[PDB]
Amino acid sequence: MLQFDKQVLPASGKISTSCQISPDGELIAICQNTDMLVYEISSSKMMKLTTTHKECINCLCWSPDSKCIASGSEDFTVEITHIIYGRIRRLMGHTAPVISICYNNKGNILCSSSMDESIKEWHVLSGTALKTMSAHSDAVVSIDIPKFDSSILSSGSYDGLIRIFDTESGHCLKTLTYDKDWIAEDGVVPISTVKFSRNGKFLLVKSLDNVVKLWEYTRGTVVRTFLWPKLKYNCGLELIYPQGKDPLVISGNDSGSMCVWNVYSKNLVQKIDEKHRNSPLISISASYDKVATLSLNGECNLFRV
Amino acid sequence: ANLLLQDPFGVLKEYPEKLTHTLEVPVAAVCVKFSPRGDYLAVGCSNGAIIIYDMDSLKPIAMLGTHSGAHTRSVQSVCWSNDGRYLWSSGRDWYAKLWDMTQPTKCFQQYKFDGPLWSCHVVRWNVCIVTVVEEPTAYVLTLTDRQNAFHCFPLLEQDQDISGHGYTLVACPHPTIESIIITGTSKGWINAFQLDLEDKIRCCYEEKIANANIKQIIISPSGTRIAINGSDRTIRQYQLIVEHSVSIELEHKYQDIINRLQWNTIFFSNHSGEYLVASAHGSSAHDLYLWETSSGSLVRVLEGADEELLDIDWNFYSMRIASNGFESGWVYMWSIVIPPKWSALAPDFEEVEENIDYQEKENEFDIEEIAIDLCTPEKYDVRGNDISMPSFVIPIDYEGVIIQQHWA
Amino acid sequence: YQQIEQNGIIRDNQIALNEKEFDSTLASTTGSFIAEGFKKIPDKLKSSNQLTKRKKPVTFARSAIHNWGLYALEPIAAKEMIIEYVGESIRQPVAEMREKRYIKSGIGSSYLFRIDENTVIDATKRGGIARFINHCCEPSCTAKIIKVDGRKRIVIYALRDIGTNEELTYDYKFPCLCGAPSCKGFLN
Amino acid sequence: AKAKTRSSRAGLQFPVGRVHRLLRKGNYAERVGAGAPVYLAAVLEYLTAEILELAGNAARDNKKTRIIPRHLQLAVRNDEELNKLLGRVTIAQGGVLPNIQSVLLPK
Amino acid sequence: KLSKLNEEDAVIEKYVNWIGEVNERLSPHFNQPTGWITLSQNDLSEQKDSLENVKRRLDLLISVRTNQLRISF
Ligand SMILES: C[S@@+](CC[C@H](N)C(=O)[O-])C[C@H]1O[C@@H](n2cnc3c(N)ncnc32)[C@H](O)[C@@H]1O
Ligand SMILES: [Zn+2]
C-alpha cells in the first residue's frame, strides 16, 4: 500500500520552509534559508542552487515543464529564476510581504498573495500589474490553482476564508466558510492551507484546529472530515496517489506524528511516525509515486506505493 | 472550464453582446483566427508579421516569422489543427508555411507559389487546401511522409470543365464527413469534391445559384447549414444533405435593404448554427450583425465599434468575436461579461431583484459517505463542448527568455 | 574558502545593487517567518424590476470607511438615482425579533430600513447592492420614498456631483468611524 | 406577427398608415418609397419613447403619477441631446430649469 | 566535457556554420536568370537577414551567461 524508500538529508541545520517536487516526478527543490537544493532521484546526485533573495524564503514554485523556479520572500521580492540561466524577472509589486504562490497551468501567470488584503497578478513577459483582488480580511497563506485546468483560484487566509476567486477578470465567485464575524466570538477557526485535488473538483483544507476536510466547492458544503485522534503552525497538506483504489491524504502535526486518512471511507490504516520525532513539520509535496516531506529541520523522506 | 460553473445563477448566453477588450496593434491586420481553445489568437498582420496573442492579458507570447519563413508580403488566411499544435498560413508572398509551435519561431515546410493566394483550409492537420489565384482547380498541398513532396493535387476531374465558371476561389471542408470538400467557383457554380485521402475525386455536386464572385462558403459545425456569400448583396444559407450524394435547398436570404452593402465575412454559431453573423463592407457600417437563422430577422447588432470590420472569428469556449477594424488596424473584441456577485461574500446571501413579501412562519418567535472519485477529469462543461481533450499548450519561449529584458 | 569569497562579491556589493526594494513605511518585519508569530492586530497599512433600467454602474469594493462600501464608477450628476433599495418586506413585530436574533449570535449590522412605520426592508440574507453604503454624517445621498404602482420602493438619489470612484455616503437619521472632523462623534 | 396594420408587421406603436398618407398629401417629393414611412414611424416612436421615458422619470421624483408640462421641460432641458434637438423651442406653461448663477450665491 | 554550456555553443555556432553553410547559397539563388514582383527575394538578403546580422547582439548574450556563471563558483 505504502512503504518507506530512502532518506538522504540530515535533520539539523538552517531554516527549512518548503519542499517541492516538479510535477515531472524527478526534480526536487528544497527551500532552505535563502538556498535551494536539487536532488535528482534517478541517479541520486545533489545540486545546490542559490538565488538573489535576501530573507527567509516562503514561496517556492515549480514549472509544469521544469524549466523555471519562482520564489518569493518578504522584502517585497517577486522573483522568477531559471534552472540554469539565472534570475529572469523581478516584479516587486506588493506593498505587503508574500507567503505562497502558484502557477497558471499554461505557465504564463505566476499568481501572487499580498498580506494587506489584496491579491494581484503578474505576467512574465509583460511584467505589469494585471489585476487586483482586494477581497480579504487577513493575511493570505496559500492560493492553489488546480492541477488540470487553470480556471479558478481558491484562496486561503488567516481569518477563516475558504474563498474562491476568478482568474479571467478577478472577482469573488464562492466562499465556503464565514469570516471573523457571523458569530464574532472566536467561533470561526483560522485556515492554514487550501488545496485542490487532481481533477480540481474537490477542494482540501487544513485549519488551525488541525482538522482536515474535503470540500465540494460546487454544492456549498463538505463531504468529508478528518480529525486527529490546536496547532501553532502553517503546515502543509498533500494527497498522495497510489495506483490502486484509494488515494490517502496527508498533513503534518505539531510534531512528527503523520497519520494518513482513507478518503473513500473514513478510516485510518497507515501512519508514518517513525521519522521527524523532534522536528515540527511545515511542507509536503509529491510526485507520481515519490512523496517528500520537510520540517523546521530538513528531513526529506521519500516513499513508494 | 470552471469559471462558468460558478459565474451565473445558471443562465449563460449564446452570443456576446458587449465589447470589452481592444488589442492595440498599430500595424494593421488581415485575418484573426483563434486557437481551437480560447487561449491563443493568431493575427494575420498586414506587413507580413504574425503577432500571436495570449487571450488573458492582451500582450503577446511569440511571433511566427523570426527564424525561418517570415512573410515578406501580406498574410491572407490561417487555420489551426485539431489540437492547436500547428498553424497553416497562407500569404501574399507566394508562400504557405506550415508552422509548429514546438519550435515557435521556425517554419517546417514551405512552397514557392506561382502567384499570390486568397485563403487556406485544413482537413487534417497536415493537408491543407489553398486557393491559388487565377486557377480553376485547387492545388491542395499535403505534407507527406517526406515534407518536400507537396503533391499539387488538382481538385478537378480530368474531363470536367468549369469553363464559364471562372476560377475556384473558396474551398471549405466538411465537418462531419471530413472527406467531401465544398468549393465555389468565381462565377456562380458550386462543386463538391470527395477526396479519398489515393487521389480519386468525384464531382458529386455541381450547380449554379446566381452569377457572382463567391467570396466565402461556410458550413455550420453540425454539417446541416451552409451559407454562401456572393459578390452581390445577398447571403444564401442552404441546408446540406450528405449521406457521396449531395443536394441543397434554399433556406433564407439576408440582405441590407437600406444601404445595400456587401458582406465581407460570415460566421455561424457553435452547435447547429442557430445564429449567423456578418460584417458589411461600406463605410458608416460600424457594426457586426446577427440573424436568427430560422426566422430570418435582424435580431441583434454588435454596436461597439467605430470603423469598418473586415474579418471575424467566433471561438465557442470564450464566446468572443475578434475582428480587425480595417481602417485603424486594431482588433476589436467582444466578450460575454459576467457582473460581480456579493452573494459569494458569505455562504448565504441572496440577490433578489424585488422587495419580496415573505410570509410569516411560526419559527420567528421560537428560541456523510457519498461516493468520492479523484481520478477522472471533467467531461462536459456548462456550454457542452468537446472538453476532456487536454489541448496542446503553446510553450513559451524557453530558449531566450533570459534575453527578454535586453533588446527584444 | 576560495570559492565563497569570490562568490562573496557576487552577494556583498551586488546585494547592495539589487536589494533596492524598499517601498513601504518600513514596518516591524524583523521577526522571522519560521517563528510564525500570529500578530492578530487590526493594523491597516493599505490606503483606506421596474426600476432596474434606471440605475448607475457603481461597484462594491473594500471601503475607505468600513468593511465594505460602494464605489461610483462614473461621474454622477446632481439628482440621479444611484440604486433602488431592494430586500425583504417584514413588519415591526417580526423585525423586532430579528433585530436582536442576529445580534444574539452577534452579526453586528443594522440591515433593516423603514418605508412606513409598520414595515421594514430587511437586507441581512436577501437584498440589493444598495445596502452596502455606510454612514457618514455629511450626506452625499438621501433616500426619498416614491411609490411605483401601489407599493413603495425606496430609491437612493444623490445630493452632489459624485465623481469616479468617489465613495458614497448616507445619513441614517434614527461612533462616527468615517474619519471626518465636521461631524458628530457618534451615530446618534 | 400579424398581416393587417403595417405597424404591427413592423412592430411599432406609431401608425405607418398615417405617415404614408402624410408623405403624399404633404407634397414632400414626387414618389415616396415603401420603406420610407416605416423608417420614419420608427424614429418618431423612438423620440417619443425617449422623451416619455425621461418625462415620467422626473414625474417619479416629483412623486406625482401623471405628467404635467413642467415635467416635460425638466426632461428636455436636463438632457443634452434633447436640448440640442429642442434648442429653439418653448414648451408652453413649462417653467425654466432651476439654476442661479453662483456669483450671486452668498458667502 | 562541459555538457551545460556546449549545447549553447553548438547552437550559437549553428548560426555561424549550420545556418552558414546552407543559407550562404541563397545569394547564388539569385543567379538563375542572370547575374520585381517576380523574384522579390533581393531585399531579404538584408531584411530577413537583418535579424541574422542582429543575431550577433544576442548569440554572444547567450554566450556570456557562463561568463557570469563560471565566475559565480
Ligand atoms: C446600515 S449597516 C451599513 C452597511 C454595512 N456597513 C455593510 O457594508 O455591509 C450599519 C453598519 O455600518 C457601520 N456604521 C454605522 N455608522 C457608521 C459610521 N458613522 N461610520 C462608519 N461605519 C458606520 C456599523 O458598523 C454597522 O455595522
Ligand atoms: Zn465622519
TrEMBL record, chain A:
> From what superkingdom does this record's organism come?
Eukaryota
Swiss-Prot/TrEMBL keywords: Repeat, WD repeat
Query: Which Gene Ontology CC terms are recorded?
Result: Set1C/COMPASS complex
Q: Name one GO molecular function term.
A: histone binding
The protein in question is named KLLA0E24487p
Placement of WD repeats on the sequence = 50-80, 91-132, 133-175, 191-225
Looking up Gene3D superfamilies in the UniProt record yields: YVTN repeat-like/Quinoprotein amine dehydrogenase
Q: What SUPFAM superfamilies does this protein's entry cite? A: WD40 repeat-like
UniProtKB/TrEMBL annotation, chain B:
User: Listed GO cellular component terms?
Assistant: Set1C/COMPASS complex
Q: Does the keyword Ribonucleoprotein apply?
A: no
Q: Where are the WD repeats?
A: 68-101
Q: Where are the transmembrane segments?
A: none
Q: Please name the InterPro entries in this protein's record.
A: RBBP5/Swd1, WD40/YVTN_repeat-like_dom_sf, WD40_repeat_CS, WD40_repeat_dom_sf, WD40_rpt
**Gene3D superfamilies annotated for this entry?**
YVTN repeat-like/Quinoprotein amine dehydrogenase
**Compartment(s):** Nucleus
**Alphabetized UniProt keyword annotations:** Nucleus, Repeat, WD repeat
| Source organism superkingdom | Eukaryota
Would the keyword Membrane turn up in this protein's UniProt record?
A: no
What is the official name of this protein in its record?
A: KLLA0A08800p
The root-end lineage is:
Eukaryota, Fungi, Dikarya, Ascomycota, Saccharomycotina
From TrEMBL, chain D:
**Chain ranges of the Histone H2A C-terminal domain:** 80-107
Listed name of the protein: Histone H2A
Q: Which residues of the full protein are shown?
A: 13 to 119 of 130
Q: How does it assemble?
A: The nucleosome is a histone octamer containing two molecules each of H2A, H2B, H3 and H4 assembled in one H3-H4 heterotetramer and two H2A-H2B heterodimers. The octamer wraps approximately 147 bp of DNA.
For this record, the Gene Ontology CC terms, alphabetical, are: nucleosome; nucleus
Tell me if Ubl conjugation is a UniProt keyword of this record: yes
Q: Which GO terms describe its molecular function?
A: DNA binding; protein heterodimerization activity; structural constituent of chromatin
Domain Core Histone H2A/H2B/H3, residue spans? 1-77
Which lineage ranks, top first, belong to the organism behind this chain?
Answer: Eukaryota, Metazoa, Chordata, Craniata, Vertebrata
The entry sums up its family as follows: Belongs to the histone H2A family.
Localization per record = Chromosome; Nucleus
User: Gene of origin?
Assistant: LOC494591
- The primary location reported for this protein is nucleus
Q: Which residues form a coiled coil?
A: none
UniProtKB/TrEMBL annotation, chain E:
Where does it primarily localize? nucleus
- Would you name any one GO CC term? Set1C/COMPASS complex
Q: Which UniProt keywords apply?
A: Metal-binding, Nucleus, Zinc, Zinc-finger
Q: Where in the cell is it found?
A: Nucleus
* GO terms of molecular function: zinc ion binding
Task: Tell me which stretches of the chain form a coiled coil.
Answer: none
User: Which biological processes are named by the entry's GO terms?
Assistant: positive regulation of DNA-templated transcription
Identify this protein by name.
KLLA0D07260p
Q: Which organism is it from?
A: Kluyveromyces lactis (strain ATCC 8585 / CBS 2359 / DSM 70799 / NBRC 1267 / NRRL Y-1140 / WM37)
Q: What is the lineage of its organism?
A: Eukaryota, Fungi, Dikarya, Ascomycota, Saccharomycotina
Intact protein stretch covered?
195 to 327 of 342
